[PDB]
């Protein structure tokens, strides 16, 4: 899949290694980049390959509380995930919001998985000098980007 490999090496690796290229042009640094498509196409396996050359810590976040033990839930964890990923920059936070858990939660609220990604997004867009120097990328993934809450 040769057309996909270049598209993400352009907008993820290049405003980190060479902030001079994107600063002359004027383009405000990329925020969210949505990875979509049918399951099994390698949505996650592509960001894994980008996290190895750039030397990102690939932190797959998921809604899993097995790893969390310090706060014990990720509903209110925002600052702590940033402060571990800012120490250990560069980083790719691979936010897989599921949003295919049926129409009980996904159509009743916009799911519980997007709730955690919208709190993330508003605080990481401005926090310290990291807002046009983010070393913690906001990589989102979903089944179809249409299914996500409209305000995302």
């Amino acid at each position: 899949l040769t057309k996909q490999i270049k598209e993400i090496k352009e907008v993820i690796e290049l405003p980190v290694k060479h902030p001079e290229l994107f600063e002359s042009l004027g383009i405000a640094q990329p925020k969210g980049v949505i990875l979509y498509g049918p399951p099994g196409t390698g949505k996650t396996l592509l960001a894994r390959a980008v996290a190895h050359h750039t030397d990102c810590k690939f932190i797959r976040v998921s809604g899993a509380e097995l790893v969390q033990k310090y706060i014990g839930e990720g509903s209110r964890m925002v600052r702590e995930l940033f402060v571990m990923a800012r120490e250990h920059a560069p980083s790719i936070i691979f936010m897989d919001e599921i949003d295919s858990i049926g129409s009980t939660r996904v159509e009743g609220s916009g799911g519980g998985d997007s709730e955690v990604q919208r709190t993330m997004l508003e605080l990481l867009n401005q926090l310290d000098g990291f807002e046009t120097s983010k070393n913690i990328k906001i990589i989102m993934a979903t089944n179809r980007l249409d299914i996500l809450d409209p305000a995302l």
Partner: protein
Amino acid sequence: TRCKLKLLRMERIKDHLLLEEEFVSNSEILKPFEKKQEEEKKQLEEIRGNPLSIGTLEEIIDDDHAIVTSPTMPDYYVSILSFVDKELLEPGCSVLLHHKTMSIVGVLQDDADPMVSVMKMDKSPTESYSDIGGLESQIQEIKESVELPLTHPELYEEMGIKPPKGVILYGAPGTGKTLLAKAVANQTSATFLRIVGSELIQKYLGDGPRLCRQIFKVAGENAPSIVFIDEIDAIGTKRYDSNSGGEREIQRTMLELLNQLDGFDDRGDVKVIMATNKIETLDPALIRPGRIDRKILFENPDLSTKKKILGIHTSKMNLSEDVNLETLVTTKDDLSGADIQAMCTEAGLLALRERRMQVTAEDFKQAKERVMKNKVEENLEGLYL
């Protein structure tokens, strides 16, 4: 260029000299200190020794006793003795006990928390007012109630009456509400707390009410303060099951939001700033004017305001004589300011794909076609109903 470097060298001749002078006078120049500082440090240290066992104060008795509870568990009825002030003793506080006979040898303990980390902000935004310029008079109502009674105590004593309180930001999206707030907290340089309204709903039940009573005790302490509740609309839909949301969780958040901002509590200075895009779901006990004074109404700007708005974003980009800045504005017919900002991020994304490093008249008229296709592909009306 030179302006910046003269001042930066001026503060690195201050920092260097002060550190050498202040290190030498703690390790060589001792005369107002000397004997009297060597006796006081020697008396307090010998008298309490070490290790010192940290405890937590459940309650005081005024005859100089306390009931402290170790965090391990075994309770103790300790004595208040020597080298202690009772001004800081009070519930919740951290005291030092002597590990044999536990007497409160003093209080100096305050141990930061990861629950007071998420609330408090470290930020200092890299934009200040007049990068929001346009909708000019909408930041000149938030400056009359946030900035102005701190800066001039004179004018609000001269007219008398109580000063304003708060504001609500609501209106069309793409009207800048989020950066408007990020600008009134950078100007004043008051202690800016910041919480999204979606963290107030958690899977845990009745944990809502404990979290926002916490938020306001931190805020009262650091006062004067500005609290951003960004997106208090979000409390209207976000829910994980029907009892972690529903009437139950939504009433718990109201009740809480009602006590913090006006109650018997007799709150100190918390200014509140809310970002929102739902006015017709809020408590009718807040848009009661006289909690919240002037509310701010925002709409899509008009064609001459959008000339001031496109001039802030286009100095960033490379500049040419070819560029037709005035004709992107004209054609747009009351279109928001979040699109104007999605068009100049799209001009350098087409520019990089070519590997041509000039932004000219051609790159901006191409980037407007991509911005008008996503919002127009999502308009599936086609033949107008």
